[PDB]
Design an enzyme around this catalytic site. Sequence first.
Site, mmCIF file in Angstrom:
data_model
loop_
_atom_site.group_PDB
_atom_site.id
_atom_site.type_symbol
_atom_site.label_atom_id
_atom_site.label_comp_id
_atom_site.label_asym_id
_atom_site.label_seq_id
_atom_site.Cartn_x
_atom_site.Cartn_y
_atom_site.Cartn_z
ATOM 1 N N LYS A 105 -25.283 -10.675 -73.821
ATOM 2 C CA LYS A 105 -26.191 -11.018 -72.738
ATOM 3 C C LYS A 105 -27.142 -12.104 -73.211
ATOM 4 O O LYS A 105 -27.364 -12.281 -74.412
ATOM 5 C CB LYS A 105 -26.986 -9.804 -72.247
ATOM 6 C CG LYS A 105 -27.434 -9.908 -70.800
ATOM 7 C CD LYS A 105 -26.274 -9.689 -69.850
ATOM 8 C CE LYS A 105 -26.681 -9.937 -68.412
ATOM 9 N NZ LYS A 105 -26.279 -8.810 -67.529
ATOM 10 N N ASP A 145 -25.938 -14.771 -63.867
ATOM 11 C CA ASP A 145 -26.593 -13.485 -63.670
ATOM 12 C C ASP A 145 -27.738 -13.683 -62.684
ATOM 13 O O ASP A 145 -27.744 -14.668 -61.939
ATOM 14 C CB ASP A 145 -27.074 -12.907 -65.005
ATOM 15 C CG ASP A 145 -27.423 -11.434 -64.915
ATOM 16 O OD1 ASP A 145 -26.491 -10.606 -64.846
ATOM 17 O OD2 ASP A 145 -28.624 -11.104 -64.912
HETATM 18 N N1 LIG Z 1 -24.521 -12.312 -61.049
HETATM 19 C C1 LIG Z 1 -23.320 -11.801 -61.320
HETATM 20 O O1 LIG Z 1 -22.342 -12.509 -61.490
HETATM 21 C C2 LIG Z 1 -23.174 -10.312 -61.417
HETATM 22 C C3 LIG Z 1 -21.798 -9.711 -61.586
HETATM 23 C C4 LIG Z 1 -21.856 -8.257 -61.660
HETATM 24 C C5 LIG Z 1 -23.055 -7.559 -61.581
HETATM 25 N N2 LIG Z 1 -24.229 -8.179 -61.429
HETATM 26 C C6 LIG Z 1 -25.453 -7.382 -61.354
HETATM 27 O O2 LIG Z 1 -25.887 -7.262 -59.998
HETATM 28 C C7 LIG Z 1 -27.293 -7.493 -59.878
HETATM 29 C C8 LIG Z 1 -27.552 -8.577 -58.841
HETATM 30 O O3 LIG Z 1 -27.199 -9.846 -59.386
HETATM 31 P P1 LIG Z 1 -27.083 -11.143 -58.442
HETATM 32 O O4 LIG Z 1 -26.121 -12.110 -59.087
HETATM 33 O O5 LIG Z 1 -26.847 -10.677 -57.027
HETATM 34 O O6 LIG Z 1 -28.562 -11.767 -58.527
HETATM 35 P P2 LIG Z 1 -29.008 -12.959 -57.545
HETATM 36 O O7 LIG Z 1 -27.970 -13.093 -56.460
HETATM 37 O O8 LIG Z 1 -29.371 -14.154 -58.389
HETATM 38 O O9 LIG Z 1 -30.358 -12.385 -56.885
HETATM 39 C C9 LIG Z 1 -30.571 -10.980 -56.776
HETATM 40 C C10 LIG Z 1 -31.112 -10.662 -55.389
HETATM 41 O O10 LIG Z 1 -31.821 -9.420 -55.415
HETATM 42 C C11 LIG Z 1 -33.131 -9.561 -54.862
HETATM 43 N N3 LIG Z 1 -34.128 -8.868 -55.712
HETATM 44 C C12 LIG Z 1 -34.597 -9.299 -56.897
HETATM 45 N N4 LIG Z 1 -35.501 -8.427 -57.411
HETATM 46 C C13 LIG Z 1 -35.621 -7.410 -56.540
HETATM 47 C C14 LIG Z 1 -36.403 -6.154 -56.464
HETATM 48 N N5 LIG Z 1 -37.263 -5.802 -57.450
HETATM 49 N N6 LIG Z 1 -36.230 -5.370 -55.378
HETATM 50 C C15 LIG Z 1 -35.380 -5.706 -54.390
HETATM 51 N N7 LIG Z 1 -34.640 -6.827 -54.394
HETATM 52 C C16 LIG Z 1 -34.714 -7.705 -55.423
HETATM 53 C C17 LIG Z 1 -33.433 -11.049 -54.813
HETATM 54 O O11 LIG Z 1 -34.122 -11.376 -53.609
HETATM 55 P P3 LIG Z 1 -34.937 -12.758 -53.493
HETATM 56 O O12 LIG Z 1 -33.899 -13.753 -53.037
HETATM 57 O O13 LIG Z 1 -36.009 -12.462 -52.474
HETATM 58 O O14 LIG Z 1 -35.453 -12.994 -54.891
HETATM 59 C C18 LIG Z 1 -32.081 -11.735 -54.920
HETATM 60 O O15 LIG Z 1 -31.638 -12.250 -53.660
HETATM 61 C C19 LIG Z 1 -27.808 -7.910 -61.245
HETATM 62 O O16 LIG Z 1 -28.685 -6.895 -61.745
HETATM 63 C C20 LIG Z 1 -26.573 -8.072 -62.115
HETATM 64 O O17 LIG Z 1 -26.732 -7.484 -63.412
HETATM 65 C C21 LIG Z 1 -24.305 -9.510 -61.349
HETATM 66 N N1 LIG Z 2 -21.657 -7.990 -64.779
HETATM 67 C C1 LIG Z 2 -21.815 -9.067 -65.749
HETATM 68 C C2 LIG Z 2 -20.657 -10.061 -65.640
HETATM 69 C C3 LIG Z 2 -21.013 -11.477 -66.060
HETATM 70 C C4 LIG Z 2 -19.838 -12.217 -66.667
HETATM 71 O O1 LIG Z 2 -19.017 -12.764 -65.902
HETATM 72 O O2 LIG Z 2 -19.737 -12.254 -67.912
HETATM 73 C C5 LIG Z 2 -23.144 -9.789 -65.559
HETATM 74 O O3 LIG Z 2 -23.217 -10.672 -64.703
HETATM 75 O O4 LIG Z 2 -24.098 -9.462 -66.267
#
Ligand SMILES: NC(=O)c1ccc[n+]([C@@H]2O[C@H](COP(=O)([O-])OP(=O)(O)OC[C@H]3O[C@@H](n4cnc5c(N)ncnc54)[C@H](OP(=O)(O)O)[C@@H]3O)[C@@H](O)[C@H]2O)c1
Ligand SMILES: N[C@@H](CCC(=O)O)C(=O)O
Length: 419
Positions: A105, A145
């Site tokens: 990470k 992320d």
């Molecule tokens: N990014 C990836 O590729 C990925 C793949 C698998 C899992 N994940 C996991 O899924 C989660 C979401 O990631 P993401 O890529 O969706 O992030 P993102 O699209 O960059 O933004 C996260 C969204 O959640 C909202 N948010 C942030 N803080 C918050 C809080 N305290 N309470 C309620 N809503 C909140 C934000 O709203 P605003 O727009 O108002 O800030 C934003 O739109 C992460 O924790 C990550 O670890 C991510």
């Molecule tokens: N769930 C992981 C996947 C990111 C990756 O593609 O390595 C994260 O976004 O933290």
Amino acid sequence: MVEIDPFEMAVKQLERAAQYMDISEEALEWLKKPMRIVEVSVPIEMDDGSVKVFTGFRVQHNWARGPTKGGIRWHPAETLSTVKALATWMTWKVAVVDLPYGGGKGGIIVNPKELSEREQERLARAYIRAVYDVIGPWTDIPAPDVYTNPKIMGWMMDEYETIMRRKGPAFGVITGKPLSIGGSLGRGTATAQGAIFTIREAAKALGIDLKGKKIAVQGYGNAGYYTAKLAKEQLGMTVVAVSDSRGGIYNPDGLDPDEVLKWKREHGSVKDFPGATNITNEELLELEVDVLAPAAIEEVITEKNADNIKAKIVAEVANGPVTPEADDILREKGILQIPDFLCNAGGVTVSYFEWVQNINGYYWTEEEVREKLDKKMTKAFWEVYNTHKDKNIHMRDAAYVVAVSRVYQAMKDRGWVKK
Ligand SMILES: NC(=O)c1ccc[n+]([C@@H]2O[C@H](COP(=O)([O-])OP(=O)(O)OC[C@H]3O[C@@H](n4cnc5c(N)ncnc54)[C@H](OP(=O)(O)O)[C@@H]3O)[C@@H](O)[C@H]2O)c1
Ligand SMILES: N[C@@H](CCC(=O)O)C(=O)O
């Protein structure tokens, strides 16, 4: 604002789950500590000409199974403990779906909403210049992320290629890239597709027809919005409530994800969406729905609302959104939980596919990626489900038994731990 320390929570989960498996003490001590942590200063030049130094972290927790994988989070509330916990979860995430990856990470303590485009590009390039010595296509592969996107990924890839003098597969140093500069089809909706597949498999296991049912999604980012859209499209679900950091909108009749996304882009938030009622995230988590998908910041379900959750299936799209105590409360309530590093493993799976395409120089189609992802997610989910059913244990624990054991085996195959 986190209830409890993320890394401490992660270690507590690891021990709680290792209580149901045969693992040596030395292996447990190895697995409870990140293998390498790099804290760097990232200096950039602001628009006014001044130089500002941010704090960046690159934490790899273990690389026994292969090169470490994990995204880069840009967050003002970020701490080194959060990055350590995320890397530890990454390890189990890549172990459960059987990928040749370790856990990693990265992060920067920054508020990207206060940075311009040029400042963001400078920050990404300076971060790459700072952490070049610990990353690579076969050492550490970052990814998008929270508050990071394929744009920043392409900037980072370009900087890495410039430093690397194009000696090897630079495209493979980082995933979640734009399609023009070595991107992969289906990576945009990867984590959402994996979450939808896991939800479908869980409904199949529970004997529940998802058509016409209700889903409430927290967070409207890359994962939350695409999860809501795919649930409305593929599973036939009815999206009754969505949210972002400023609040949420609820509608008993259902919401169209595209209109909500357009409103969010044109206003900055989903608040005051026409035809919907404004609510809080706490209220959204407590709604009477059939599926609840937290896709936002971690630690949203604790002893302050664990008993108020009324969803049949909780799909932990986010990374570590539920505390172990809250896990116990939810399991006592008969609520099926898809573990965090199993539900959202689709993203890391399609990132692995993109890395394979980059290192091989040959790129696949949408159908091939979709089929391979479906196959991998179904196999992993059914392994975890049968694991939890045979041993009569919590879901979270069972996935650990599926994941950690594999990692454990890797060490025994490397000589890192004798026992
Ligand atoms: N990014 C990836 O590729 C990925 C793949 C698998 C899992 N994940 C996991 O899924 C989660 C979401 O990631 P993401 O890529 O969706 O992030 P993102 O699209 O960059 O933004 C996260 C969204 O959640 C909202 N948010 C942030 N803080 C918050 C809080 N305290 N309470 C309620 N809503 C909140 C934000 O709203 P605003 O727009 O108002 O800030 C934003 O739109 C992460 O924790 C990550 O670890 C991510
Ligand atoms: N769930 C992981 C996947 C990111 C990756 O593609 O390595 C994260 O976004 O933290």
